[PDB]
Amino acid sequence: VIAVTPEEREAVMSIDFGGAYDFTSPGFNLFEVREKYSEPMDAAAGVVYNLLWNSGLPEKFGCREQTLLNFILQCRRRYRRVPYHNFYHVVDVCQTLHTYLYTGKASELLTELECYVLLVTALVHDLDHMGVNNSFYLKTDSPLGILSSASGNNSVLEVHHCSLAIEILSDPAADVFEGLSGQDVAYAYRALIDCVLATDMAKHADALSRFTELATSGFEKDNDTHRRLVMETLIKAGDVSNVTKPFETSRMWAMAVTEEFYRQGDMEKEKGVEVLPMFDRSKNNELARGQIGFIDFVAGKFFRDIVGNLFHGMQWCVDTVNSNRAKWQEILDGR
Amino acid sequence: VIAVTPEEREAVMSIDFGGAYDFTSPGFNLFEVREKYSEPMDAAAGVVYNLLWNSGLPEKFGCREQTLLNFILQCRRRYRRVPYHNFYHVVDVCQTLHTYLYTGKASELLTELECYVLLVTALVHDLDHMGVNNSFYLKTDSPLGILSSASGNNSVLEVHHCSLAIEILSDPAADVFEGLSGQDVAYAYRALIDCVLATDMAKHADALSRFTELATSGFEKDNDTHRRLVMETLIKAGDVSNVTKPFETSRMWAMAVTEEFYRQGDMEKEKGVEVLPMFDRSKNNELARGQIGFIDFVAGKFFRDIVGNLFHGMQWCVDTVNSNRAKWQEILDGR
Numbered sequence: 313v314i315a316v317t318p319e320e321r322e323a324v325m326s327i328d329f330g331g332a333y334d335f336t337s338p339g340f341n342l343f344e345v346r347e348k349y350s351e352p353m354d355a356a357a358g359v360v361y362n363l364l365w366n367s368g369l370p371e372k373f374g375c376r377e378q379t380l381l382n383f384i385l386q387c388r389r390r391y392r393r394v395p396y397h398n399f400y401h402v403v404d405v406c407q408t409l410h411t412y413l414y415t416g417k418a419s420e421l422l423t424e425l426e427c428y429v430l431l432v433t434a435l436v437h438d439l440d441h442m443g444v445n446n447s448f449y450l451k452t453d454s455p456l457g458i459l460s461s462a463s464g465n466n467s468v469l470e471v472h473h474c475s476l477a478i479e480i481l482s483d484p485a486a487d488v489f490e491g492l493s494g495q496d497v498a499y500a501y502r503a504l505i506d507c508v509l510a511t512d513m514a515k516h517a518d519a520l521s522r523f524t525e526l527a528t529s530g531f532e533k534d535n536d537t538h539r540r541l542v543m544e545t546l547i548k549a550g551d552v553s554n555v556t557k558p559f560e561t562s563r564m565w566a567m568a569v570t571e572e573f574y575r576q577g578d579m580e581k582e583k584g585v586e587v588l589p590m591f592d593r594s595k596n597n598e599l600a601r602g603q604i605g606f607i608d609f610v611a612g613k614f615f616r617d618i619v620g621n622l623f624h625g626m627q628w629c630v631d632t633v634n635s636n637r638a639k640w641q642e643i644l645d646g647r
Numbered sequence: 648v649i650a651v652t653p654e655e656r657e658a659v660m661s662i663d664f665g666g667a668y669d670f671t672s673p674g675f676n677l678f679e680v681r682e683k684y685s686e687p688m689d690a691a692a693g694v695v696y697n698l699l700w701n702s703g704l705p706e707k708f709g710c711r712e713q714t715l716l717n718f719i720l721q722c723r724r725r726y727r728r729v730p731y732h733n734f735y736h737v738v739d740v741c742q743t744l745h746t747y748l749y750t751g752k753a754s755e756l757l758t759e760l761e762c763y764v765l766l767v768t769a770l771v772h773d774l775d776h777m778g779v780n781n782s783f784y785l786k787t788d789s790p791l792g793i794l795s796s797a798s799g800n801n802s803v804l805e806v807h808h809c810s811l812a813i814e815i816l817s818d819p820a821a822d823v824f825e826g827l828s829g830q831d832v833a834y835a836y837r838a839l840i841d842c843v844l845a846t847d848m849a850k851h852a853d854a855l856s857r858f859t860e861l862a863t864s865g866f867e868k869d870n871d872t873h874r875r876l877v878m879e880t881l882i883k884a885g886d887v888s889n890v891t892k893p894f895e896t897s898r899m900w901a902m903a904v905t906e907e908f909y910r911q912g913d914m915e916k917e918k919g920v921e922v923l924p925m926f927d928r929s930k931n932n933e934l935a936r937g938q939i940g941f942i943d944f945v946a947g948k949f950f951r952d953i954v955g956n957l958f959h960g961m962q963w964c965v966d967t968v969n970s971n972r973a974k975w976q977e978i979l980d981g982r
C-alpha cells in the first residue's frame with residue numbers, strides 16, 4: 313500500500329480559494345478553477361475536500377479530516393490523463409450531486425448516511441477509466457472484456473470501478489467509513505456498489521423505467537429499496553448533467569467528451585473493429601447536432617422525467633437544458 | 648508497475664539443483680526442495696523456470712527467457728504467506744499438470760498452445776489468495792462478498808485471480824503471450840480465464856457432469872470446446888491432486904490445508920459467524936478422518952471418473968489415491 317505523503321496533503325491544503333467560489337452553488341464553474349490555479353489537480357482536490365468537510369457529514373459519521381483528504385488523493389491517483397473521464401469529471405459529479413441534494417432538496421428523500429455515501433461514491437464511480445467505453449472492451453477482445461463475458465457481467469468498467477473503490481477503502485488511512493458501526497459499514501458498501509453499477513448506460517432505459525414506476529406508484533421514504541432507487545437515479549443524473557450546466561460550461565464538457573470519443577475511434581480503426589460515426593474524427597460531426605441529440609434522446613429526456621415526477625426542486629436543471637437546446641438549435645440554423 | 652530487478656532474477660538463476668531432481672516426474676517432492684534450500688522461494692521459482700523453459704514451449708511461442716522469469720517472479724510477489732494457498736501451491740499445480748500432460752499423455756488431447764497456456768495458468772490461478780474461501784466473504788459481509796452479491800458472480804476469489812493475472816500480463820516485461828498473434832492472444836486469454844474460473848469448487852458437480860457428457864458423446868480433438876473442457880478438467884485435477892501424491896507428501900500437504908482452514912475458523916470465531924467442523928481448531932479432528940472424507944466424496948470419485956472416462960494415462964493417480972485411503976484407514980484402525 314502506497315501511503316499519501318504530507319507533501320501531497322499540504323499541496324491541497326495550501327490552495328487558497330480566497331472565498332471567491334461557492335462550491336455549493338449550481339453556478340460553480342470547475343473550468344474556471346482549473347484555469348486560475350497553477351496546480352489544477354490540487355485545486356480540484358481542494359474543491360471536494362472543502363465541500364465535503366464543510367457539509368458536516370464526514371464529522372457526523374466519524375471520518376477524520378486527514379482520512380477524507382487521503383481518500384480524495386487515493387482516488388485522484390487512480391484517474392488517468394484522458395480527455396473526459398479524468399479526476400475533474402468525478403469532482404464535477406460530486407459537486408453536482410451536492411447541489412441536487414441540498415439546493416435541489418433531494419436530501420429530503422434520503423437519510424444523512426445515504427447522502428454521505430452518495431457524495432463519497434461520486435469520487436470512486438469512474439476509477440481507472442482508460443478513455444474507452446464498455447463496448448470497446450468487448451469488440452476488441454480485450455482481456456477485461458473477455459473476463460467480463462466469462463464471468464457473466466456486461467458492466468465491464470463499473471465492476472472494475474467497484475473493485476478499486478474497495479481496494480482504496482481497505483486502507484485504514486483512507487477509510488472514510490472508519491467511524492461507522494459494522495452494520496452501517498456493510499450497508500454503506502452495498503449502497504456505494506449499487507450506485508456505481510447503476511451508472512452503466514446499458515441499463516439506462518430500464519433504470520428510467522423503474523424510476524418512473526416508483527414515482528407513479530408513490531415514494532415511501534421508510535422503504536430502503538425506494539431510497540436506493542433514488543440514490544441510483546441521482547448519481548445517474550449527475551453523470552449526464554453536463555448538458556444542464558450554463559451553456560459555455562456545457563460546451564467545454566462537450567469538447568472534452570468529443571476528444572475522448574475520437575481517441576477511442578482512433579484505436580478502433582487500428583484494431584479493425586466497427587467505429588460508430590460519433591467516434592470517427594474523419595466524419596466531421598457537428599457539435600451542435602450531437603448535443604441536441606444527447607439532449608433529446610438521453611439527458612434532456614432523463615432530467616425532464618425525473619424532475620417532473622419526483623425531484624421537483626431541481627427545476628433549474630430542466631430550464632437550463634431547454635435553454636441550451638435552443639442555443640444549439642440557433643447555432644444550427646445559423647450555419 | 649514495479650519492475651523485477653536483475654538481482655531478483657540472479658537470485659533464482661544462481662540456484663543449483665545439480666541432477667538431484669527430475670521436475671518432470673510424478674515423484675518429484677517439492678517439500679524436499681523447500682526444506683533443503685536456504686532460499687526456498689527462489690528455489691521454487693527455479694523449479695518452474697527450469698521446467699517451463701526446458702519444455703520448449705516458451706521458445707516455440709516466442710516467449711523470451713527473461714520474460715518468463717519476470718512473469719514467474721511477478722506471480723510470486725502476489726502470493727501471501729498463508730499456510731496453503733502460497734506460492735508453493737501454484738508451483739506444485741504447475742509441476743503436477745506437466746506430469747499429467749506428458750507422463751500422463753494428456754497432451755495428446757490438446758494443441759501445443761493449449762499445453763503452454765495451461766502451464767502458465769497454473770501460476771496465476773490463486774493470485775493474492777488470503778487464506779479464506781469464497782464462503783467466508785459472504786458470511787462476514789466483506790466488501791468483496793457484497794460486490795459478488797450485487798454483480799451476480801459467486802466466484803469471489805477466482806474472478807480476483809483473473810484480474811491480477813491480466814494486470815501482470817499487461818506488463819511487456821512479463822507478458823508470456825508476447826510472441827502470440829493477436830488471434831492467439833485472445834484465444835490464450837479466454838483459455839486462461841476459463842481455466843481459473845473452473846477451479847471454484849462450488850461448480851465441481853456441474854464441471855464433472857459436463858466432463859462426463861463429453862465422454863458420453865465422444866471426445867473430438869478437432870472440437871475447440873472439447874479441448875477447452877479438457878483443459879478445465881486438468882487444472883481442476885491438479886488443484887485437488889494432493890491426495891494422489893506419495894503418502895508422506897500427501898500428508899504434508901494435508902497438514903498445510905488443515906492449518907489454513909483452522910486459521911479461517913479462528914477468524915470466523917472472531918467475527919461471530921458460524922464455523923464448520925473442518926475449520927474448527929478446537930475440535931482437534933484426526934487428519935486421517937478429514938482426508939478419508941475428502942477422498943471418498945470429492946477427490947476419489949473425481950480422479951476415478953476422469954481417468955476411467957478419458958485420461959487413461961493417469962492411472963497412477965487413481966492407484967495412489969486408493970493406496971493413500973488405505974493408509975489413512977490403517978492409521979485410524981490402528982488408533
Ligand SMILES: CC(C)Cn1c(=O)n(C)c(=O)c2nc[nH]c21
Nearest residue numbers: 551552554555565566569603606
Ligand atoms: C461521456 C458519456 C458517458 C456521457 N455523455 C456526455 O456526458 N455528453 C456530454 C455527451 O455529449 C454524450 N454523448 C454521448 N454520451 C455523452
Ligand SMILES: CC(C)Cn1c(=O)n(C)c(=O)c2nc[nH]c21
Nearest residue numbers: 886887889890900901904938941
Ligand atoms: C484447498 C481445498 C479447497 C481443496 N482441498 C484439498 O486440497 N485437500 C488436500 C483437502 O484435504 C481438502 N479438504 C477439503 N478441501 C480440500
Ligand SMILES: [Mg+2]
Nearest residue numbers: 437438469511
Ligand atoms: Mg462510468
Ligand SMILES: [Mg+2]
Nearest residue numbers: 772773804846
Ligand atoms: Mg483457488
Ligand SMILES: [Zn+2]
Nearest residue numbers: 401437438551
Ligand atoms: Zn461518470
Ligand SMILES: [Zn+2]
Nearest residue numbers: 736772773886
Ligand atoms: Zn489452487
